[PDB]
């Protein structure tokens, strides 16, 4: 239950933001079932910065998505708890919206990362983060 | 990549054993698909000691087992990598024998722990560990419902 110290609310993370070590790294995902690509990439993202925050889609927000699985088999608290058990993760935050844009606006990462092959230029959040001079990049699973 | 520092062979861990923080806690399992019960259990096992070592059954070892189905969804190195990524885990070793008895012989853990209500007196490794002044005990482990498990396996396959 000690890794649970990482589960935090958007408001609490927002208050704490100014005291986080730079550079702050952010990523988001469903993380329904953890596999080796997830953790390999979660570890590399941590290596890019001093602090790693993971945003986790709420059950619903997960339901507003056509590409990935429709109903995650694990409830948002369980998906978040697994992430928190990870050595490389510092903070795990849930968000309800369909996209992580307002969460990212609130968190204000210096570095935004995505796992997989994803055009970062096609992402709203890339523009958001680069908009204030941050970096956005994709890190491959394998 | 940093977390892979924890994946080690029996011989190297055995040679390193004397300098590990005591008490050394050992547990073993297949750990096919991690769930919250697993990580809750591993944290509790870690809290019993100063150092946690996880024995991971080899794919061949699983074949050899009558537990659940006859095979695993993830190969041994992926199952070991997942565990090594956990904050509470210090060392992950894979064994190929039917049971972890020999590995436990080589590792010499001070505390053997098992999740669930399991008669520890019926395990050879319990007597072995108690034989050199160590401890063996069961601590509650939360299993996921069979349905969720079957849904999980399917998902993995997909």
How many Å lie between the alpha carbon of A139 and the closest alpha carbon of chain B?
Answer: 13
CA distance B57 to B62: 6
Domain ranges of chain A: 1-142
Give yes or no for a contact between A140 and A41, defined as CB atoms under 8 angstroms apart: yes
CA distance A125 to A101: 5
Nearest to A82 among B39, B74, B81 (CB): B39
CA distance B69 to B38: 18
Question: Which residue out of A76, A85, A89 would a mutagenesis test of the B interface target, given it has the greatest number of B Cβ atoms within 10 Å?
Answer: A85
Task: Kindly list the residues from chain B whose CB atom is less than 8 angstroms away from the CB atom of residue A44.
Answer: 1
Give yes or no for a contact between B155 and B131, defined as CB atoms under 8 angstroms apart: no
H-type helices in B5-145, by residue range?
A: 10-16, 36-47, 59-63, 76-84, 101-107, 124-131
Give the single-character DSSP code of B64.
Answer: T
Residue A56, burial from CB neighbour count under 10 angstroms (0-12, 13-18, 19+): buried
In sequence order, which residues have a C-beta less than 8 Å from that of residue A106 and are 6 or more positions away? A10, A13, A14
B94's enclosing H/E stretch is strand B91-95
Q: CA A80, A84, A89, A92 torsion: positive or negative?
A: positive
CA distance B83 to B98: 21
Taking an 8 Å cut-off on Cβ atoms, the answer to whether B39 and A73 are in contact is no
User: What number of other Cβ atoms are within 10 A of residue A127's Cβ?
Assistant: 13
Residue numbers followed by a gap, chain A, C–N over 2.5 Å: none
B155–A contact, CB cutoff 8 A: yes
B1–A contact, CB cutoff 8 A: yes
Taking an 8 Å cut-off on Cβ atoms, the answer to whether A1 and B151 are in contact is no
Alpha-carbon separation of residue A129 from A49, A119, A135, B51, B72 (angstroms): 15, 15, 7, 40, 41
Give yes or no for a contact between B5 and A90, defined as CB atoms under 8 angstroms apart: no
User: In angstroms, what is the C-alpha Rg of chain A?
Assistant: 14
How many Å lie between the alpha carbon of A34 and the closest alpha carbon of chain B?
Answer: 7
Structure tokens at B105: 């012989």
Phi then psi for residue A135, to 5 deg, are -120, 150
């Amino acid at each position: 239950a000690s890794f649970e110290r990482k589960l935090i609310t958007r408001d609490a993370l927002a208050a704490m933001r100014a005291s986080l070590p730079a550079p702050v790294v952010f990523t988001n995902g469903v993380f329904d079932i953890l596999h080796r690509g997830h953790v390999s990439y979660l570890a590399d993202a941590k290596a890019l910065g001093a602090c790693l925050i993971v945003g986790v889609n709420s059950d619903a927000s997960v339901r507003m998505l056509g590409k990935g699985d429709d109903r995650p088999i694990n409830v948002q608290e369980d998906r978040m708890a697994l992430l928190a058990a990870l050595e490389c993760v510092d903070w795990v935050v849930g968000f309800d919206e369909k996209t992580p844009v307002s969460l990212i606006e609130a968190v204000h990462p210096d570095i935004l990362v995505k796992g997989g092959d994803y055009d970062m230029d096609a992402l709203p959040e890339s523009a958001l983060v680069r908009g204030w001079g941050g970096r956005a990049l994709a890190i491959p699973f394998e």
